Design an enzyme around this catalytic site. Structure first.
Site, PDB file in Angstrom:
ATOM      1  N   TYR A  58       0.854  -1.193   0.000  1.00 25.42           N
ATOM      2  CA  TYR A  58       0.000   0.000   0.000  1.00 25.42           C
ATOM      3  C   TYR A  58       0.872   1.219   0.000  1.00 25.42           C
ATOM      4  CZ  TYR A  58      -4.376   2.264   1.598  1.00 25.42           C
ATOM      5  OH  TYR A  58      -5.518   2.988   1.714  1.00 25.42           O
ATOM      6  N   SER A 131       3.795  -7.061   1.584  1.00 23.38           N
ATOM      7  CA  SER A 131       2.745  -6.584   2.484  1.00 23.38           C
ATOM      8  C   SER A 131       1.393  -6.898   1.895  1.00 23.38           C
ATOM      9  CB  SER A 131       3.043  -5.131   2.872  1.00 23.38           C
ATOM     10  OG  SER A 131       2.375  -4.781   4.025  1.00 23.38           O
ATOM     11  N   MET A 132       0.597  -5.912   1.492  1.00 16.79           N
ATOM     12  CA  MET A 132      -0.655  -6.199   0.818  1.00 16.79           C
ATOM     13  C   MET A 132      -0.402  -6.932  -0.508  1.00 16.79           C
ATOM     14  SD  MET A 132      -3.254  -3.073   1.103  1.00 16.79           S
ATOM     15  CE  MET A 132      -3.789  -2.582   2.660  1.00 16.79           C
ATOM     16  N   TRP A 156       0.501  -8.975   4.465  1.00 23.35           N
ATOM     17  CA  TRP A 156      -0.527  -8.336   5.147  1.00 23.35           C
ATOM     18  C   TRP A 156      -1.836  -8.743   4.464  1.00 23.35           C
ATOM     19  CZ3 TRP A 156      -4.894  -5.607   4.351  1.00 23.35           C
ATOM     20  CH2 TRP A 156      -5.315  -4.556   5.192  1.00 23.35           C
ATOM     21  N   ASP A 177       8.699  -6.376  12.584  1.00 23.77           N
ATOM     22  CA  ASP A 177       7.698  -5.682  11.774  1.00 23.77           C
ATOM     23  C   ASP A 177       6.587  -5.129  12.700  1.00 23.77           C
ATOM     24  OD1 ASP A 177       5.642  -5.118   9.863  1.00 23.77           O
ATOM     25  OD2 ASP A 177       6.441  -6.672   8.536  1.00 23.77           O
ATOM     26  N   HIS A 208       9.560  -3.778   8.735  1.00 23.53           N
ATOM     27  CA  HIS A 208       8.629  -4.238   7.637  1.00 23.53           C
ATOM     28  C   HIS A 208       9.260  -4.180   6.267  1.00 23.53           C
ATOM     29  CE1 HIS A 208       4.651  -4.733   5.906  1.00 23.53           C
ATOM     30  NE2 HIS A 208       4.663  -3.527   5.343  1.00 23.53           N
TER      31      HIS A 208
END
Length: 263
Positions: A58, A131-132, A156, A177, A208
């Site tokens: 993101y 992540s996303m 994520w 993270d 992260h």
């Protein structure tokens, strides 16, 4: 059914900044179903290679994940790094776009004007992302079990249940993270997967961004990502040990693996 490319690997060859093949790249002129893309490919792999699509997190763009393009492509893969239609796209949308990238790569493979005409084995594909974009890669794997490998980093997702995933999946996690904490994201996702070859590699002290461009563990993380993609995308049992081993690194705070034979 193996698709071996390149020489017999060593720890050193996998830890180096590049593999044996010469890499070239291009920007996709008219992206279809995602925002932008860069395609990295080996000029001289000695046969068709599989394709890997990589998605950022993101707000993030290709720069976060761009180091994987040359790193993988130099070992014998066609890699597409993407920007999303919106930097604020959510995981399900990122998955759709990841798959769209793969589809465009296949299109290019069949397009006689393209630099990658005939270079791709469209039956052998993989997914990665941060992540996303890592949650997106997991969704891709769940929805498309013919994918040969998945290797998200710092994933994520608002759900941790990826129990349907049968695709060989390596989870890169980052110990410290604070965005997608390991104890609520990466590790529950890992634990959720009961039907596949899988691996959990936590980077000691990592933030992260610990697996992003510029990280200080590129030797270890690049070895593992390439080894996993080789083992599983290529069915290259030369890489069983490198894919399935505990890497015996003080750079790793936690290592887990299941259904992953060394030999």
């Amino acid at each position: 059914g193996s698709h071996m490319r390149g020489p017999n690997p060593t720890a050193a060859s996998l830890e180096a900044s590049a593999g044996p093949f010469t890499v070239r790249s291009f920007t996709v002129s008219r992206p279809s179903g995602y925002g932008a893309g860069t395609v990295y490919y080996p000029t001289n792999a000695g046969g068709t290679v599989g394709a890997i699509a990589i998605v950022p997190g993101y707000t993030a763009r290709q720069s976060s994940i761009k180091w994987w393009g040359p790193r993988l492509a130099s070992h014998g893969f066609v890699v597409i790094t993407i920007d999303t239609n919106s930097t604020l796209d959510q995981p399900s949308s990122r998955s759709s776009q990841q798959m769209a990238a793969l589809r465009q790569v296949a299109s290019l493979n069949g397009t006689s004007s393209s630099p990658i005409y005939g270079k791709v084995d469209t039956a052998r594909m993989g997914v990665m992302g941060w992540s996303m974009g890592g949650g997106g890669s997991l969704i891709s794997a769940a929805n498309n079990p013919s994918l040969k490998a998945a290797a998200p980093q710092a994933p994520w997702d608002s759900s941790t249940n990826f129990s349907s995933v049968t695709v060989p999946t390596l989870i890169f996690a980052c110990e410290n993270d604070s965005i997608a904490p390991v104890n609520s994201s990466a590790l529950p996702i890992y634990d959720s997967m009961s039907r596949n070859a899988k691996q959990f590699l936590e980077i000691n002290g990592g933030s992260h961004s610990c697996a992003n461009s510029g990280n200080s563990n590129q030797a270890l993380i690049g070895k593992k990502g390439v080894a996993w993609m080789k083992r599983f995308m290529d069915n290259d049992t030369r890489y069983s040990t490198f894919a399935c081993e505990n890497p015996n690194s003080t750079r790793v705070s936690d290592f887990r693996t299941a259904n992953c034979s060394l030999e």
